[PDB]
Amino acid sequence: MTPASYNLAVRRAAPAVVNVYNRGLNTNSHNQLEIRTLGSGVIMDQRGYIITNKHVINDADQIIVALQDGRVFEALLVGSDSLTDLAVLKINATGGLPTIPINARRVPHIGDVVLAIGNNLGQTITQGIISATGRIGLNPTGRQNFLQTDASINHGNSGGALVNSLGELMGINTLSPEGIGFAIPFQLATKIMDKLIRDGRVIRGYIGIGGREIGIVVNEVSPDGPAANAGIQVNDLIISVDNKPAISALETMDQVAEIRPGSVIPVVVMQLTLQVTIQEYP
Amino acid sequence: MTPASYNLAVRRAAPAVVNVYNRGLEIRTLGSGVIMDQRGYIITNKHVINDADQIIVALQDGRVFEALLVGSDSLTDLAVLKINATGGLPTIPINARRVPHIGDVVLAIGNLGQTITQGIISATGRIGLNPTGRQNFLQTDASINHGNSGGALVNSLGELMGINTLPEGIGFAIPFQLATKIMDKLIRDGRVIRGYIGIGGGIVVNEVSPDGPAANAGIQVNDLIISVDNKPAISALETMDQVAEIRPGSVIPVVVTLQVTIQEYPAT
Amino acid sequence: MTPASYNLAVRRAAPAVVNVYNRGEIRTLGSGVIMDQRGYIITNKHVINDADQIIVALQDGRVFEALLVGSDSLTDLAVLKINATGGLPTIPINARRVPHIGDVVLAIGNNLGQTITQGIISATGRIGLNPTGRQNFLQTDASINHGNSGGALVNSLGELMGINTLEGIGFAIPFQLATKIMDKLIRDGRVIRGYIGIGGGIVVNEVSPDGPAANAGIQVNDLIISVDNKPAISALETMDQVAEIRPGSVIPVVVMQLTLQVTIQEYPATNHHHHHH
Ligand code: NI
């Protein structure tokens, strides 16, 4: 008989998970390059784009990437996002690169087996399940809406890959309380990377409104916010946003986040139609 | 190929696991519970609902209910709640004939929202009523924290193995067979009544509790009990489970032939 | 349907995992693994250290007094023997089984009774006799504690992957190495390692003072193309070969082309290996 094994996922995925080194020039008195911080990263495609954690590369004078096949590259920082703790790196590779398996049509499910891959002790693999799937939208809601897993997530595998039993990327491990780890869902991680590549930063739309649906009841209105300037008031009920029926608070704030700053959109509330000018997130 | 997944167990079991809010009016304590049946009975931990002025239950489908306290048991750290069942309730899958085995895959289901973790059964534990302590509870390496305490332990079919209860790596759960028995006794009597013979240690008697049933019947230390209540005593642990099932006030012979009357287990 | 279960592995393996009692009162507790019908048992050195009397308890209730055959500091392994004429449960062992990263494993150990936890192989480790440190043991996310230390790490067939030895990363001696160590402890009462005194054709980085290499005339920066009539491709593999060579043996070492006769010696006794230094 065949022993039960996730080795298939490992062989398919693991070569695309790299070591990431943060080196400073002010770290020691002799101003020689020295490692400040270590972490993991995931090679996304053959152009040399790599996703890692922002906290791994913060204030780096030099970023080094090391592949499992022995190759070492200096990396350039494309951009970073504090809200997701993600950063994107670019290495210049000759001769091809290993790349993480991805299936964009795969729907992650609570209970899916996952392996956490991270690269002192060498490349480590730990196993768990998806505890919670989290949200793929741009509106930051906090950590509760990231992907949760009971696969051990430590400083060793942070910025590394979370894959399913087929070796397909589920998310990017991010260190952040009791026996539970977090990852950025891959669908969101991909969106963040494309935005960082294009704009050098993640641009979010911000309407400055709190609320919860029973339409959507407004609990609070941010001061000097787009909603306040438009004339929106507390206790008001928003039945539509940008010609999109609003059945949900979380769903609506995700829609706003996609809307580019400077865009004017109708906000229907009960019936007064207000013209709101979307602004960049804080 | 499809990804390896326990999502089947999740889909079946998870809707039956609820949040429990202890209010003393603000929320003092939080926990999880398991809807047992369509009558609206819910099992949770005693330590969750202790000193509650009001108890509230929230289902994954968003419905919120005020809950009645039916009763609780310190020894198993279980409590039973009851809520309005009118509209119909999601219930935990249960198989009374299912025999749990060491090595069985289990999911612990129960702040950050509903949380599901995976592990195996390390030890099956005893389903009897005589309190033995936590060592005889079901043990699992599926992470057990405050978040899931009072929540469900289920197998890959979604069937209920146990009720989660609080080294560092091992979690404990009341075996579902014992939880079922506790719940029924709480529904009937409003508390768990246990038969108590007051004997430690055929079966060699190590000690005899003072002013206990055994002492009053004439049983002396170092005596050998070959039978209790027309049953052979092969095992101490199994004999005490039998005693626990016996109603207080009942007179049974103890062959060592002495007549003893059962006393209700000490409340503390 | 049927519930997903590793119980098969449990029924095959767990009976062979025993409680080990170090008494001097009981100074220390631990777990052990019955390896074969002869009654040899593997456990941890740190469990049986300074033991006046060692006792072994099987899950079936039988209890035995154990003889200490020997121990090895580098692998934290020790071997016990018990005399049992009533037959013994043995751990399943498959010597042709190749452990892979990602294999499911159960950690079995024998307070709170026998405990079983589940995880995977994070890293396979090395089976060589030359000590490399903890980095090269087998790594697993199956919880490894005082409870199961010295106990068995098995795959889903109940076959032995390794022997548990003490964050969320557990270590075990790979079974292939554990078997080699046990056989050496049984024969010699201690692990005797061949030592050439060289740092890692193969470019020599350093030559230990008063060492076998130094006495043979080998110099630093030299290239070793052969050792004991075997090609030297790799440093790690070559030091494993030397480790198997009995002390006192005289082997040729070809270097570029001078042939040198080296007298292998015992590995200088080092309790300092795992110390940082
Ligand atoms: Ni030292």
Short mmCIF file of N, CA, C and O in Angstrom, two decimals, chain C residues 4 23 36 53 68 74 108 128 152 155 162 169 243 264-265:
data_model
loop_
_atom_site.label_atom_id
_atom_site.label_comp_id
_atom_site.label_asym_id
_atom_site.label_seq_id
_atom_site.Cartn_x
_atom_site.Cartn_y
_atom_site.Cartn_z
N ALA C 4 -12.52 9.19 7.81
CA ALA C 4 -11.08 9.24 7.60
C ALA C 4 -10.35 8.92 8.90
O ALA C 4 -10.61 9.52 9.94
N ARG C 23 14.93 5.19 37.52
CA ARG C 23 14.86 5.29 38.97
C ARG C 23 16.25 5.38 39.58
O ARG C 23 17.17 4.68 39.16
N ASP C 36 12.75 -5.33 17.87
CA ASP C 36 12.70 -6.70 17.37
C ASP C 36 12.33 -7.69 18.47
O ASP C 36 12.36 -7.36 19.65
N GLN C 53 18.25 1.81 38.14
CA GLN C 53 17.41 0.73 37.61
C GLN C 53 16.44 1.25 36.55
O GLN C 53 15.74 2.24 36.78
N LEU C 68 20.87 -1.86 30.22
CA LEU C 68 21.33 -0.77 29.37
C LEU C 68 22.49 -1.25 28.52
O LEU C 68 23.57 -1.51 29.03
N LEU C 74 25.57 12.03 20.46
CA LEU C 74 25.33 12.79 19.24
C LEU C 74 23.91 12.64 18.70
O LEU C 74 23.32 13.61 18.22
N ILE C 108 3.93 8.75 18.38
CA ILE C 108 3.35 7.92 19.42
C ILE C 108 4.25 7.95 20.64
O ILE C 108 5.45 7.71 20.55
N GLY C 128 23.48 9.44 7.66
CA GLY C 128 24.90 9.18 7.84
C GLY C 128 25.36 9.14 9.29
O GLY C 128 24.72 9.70 10.18
N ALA C 152 7.89 6.61 18.99
CA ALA C 152 7.95 6.31 17.58
C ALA C 152 7.28 7.38 16.73
O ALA C 152 6.26 7.94 17.09
N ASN C 155 4.60 6.27 9.72
CA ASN C 155 3.76 6.73 8.62
C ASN C 155 2.37 6.11 8.71
O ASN C 155 2.05 5.43 9.69
N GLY C 162 11.06 7.26 12.24
CA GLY C 162 12.10 7.81 13.08
C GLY C 162 11.81 7.68 14.57
O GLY C 162 10.73 7.23 14.95
N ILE C 169 8.37 23.03 15.80
CA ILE C 169 9.13 22.09 14.97
C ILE C 169 9.73 20.97 15.83
O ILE C 169 10.56 21.21 16.70
N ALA C 243 33.42 7.54 8.66
CA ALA C 243 32.76 7.23 9.93
C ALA C 243 32.52 5.72 10.09
O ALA C 243 32.55 5.20 11.20
N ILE C 264 43.28 5.55 10.35
CA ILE C 264 42.04 6.09 10.89
C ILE C 264 42.04 5.94 12.40
O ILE C 264 42.58 4.97 12.93
N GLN C 265 41.43 6.90 13.08
CA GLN C 265 41.35 6.87 14.53
C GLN C 265 39.89 7.03 14.96
O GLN C 265 39.02 7.34 14.14
#
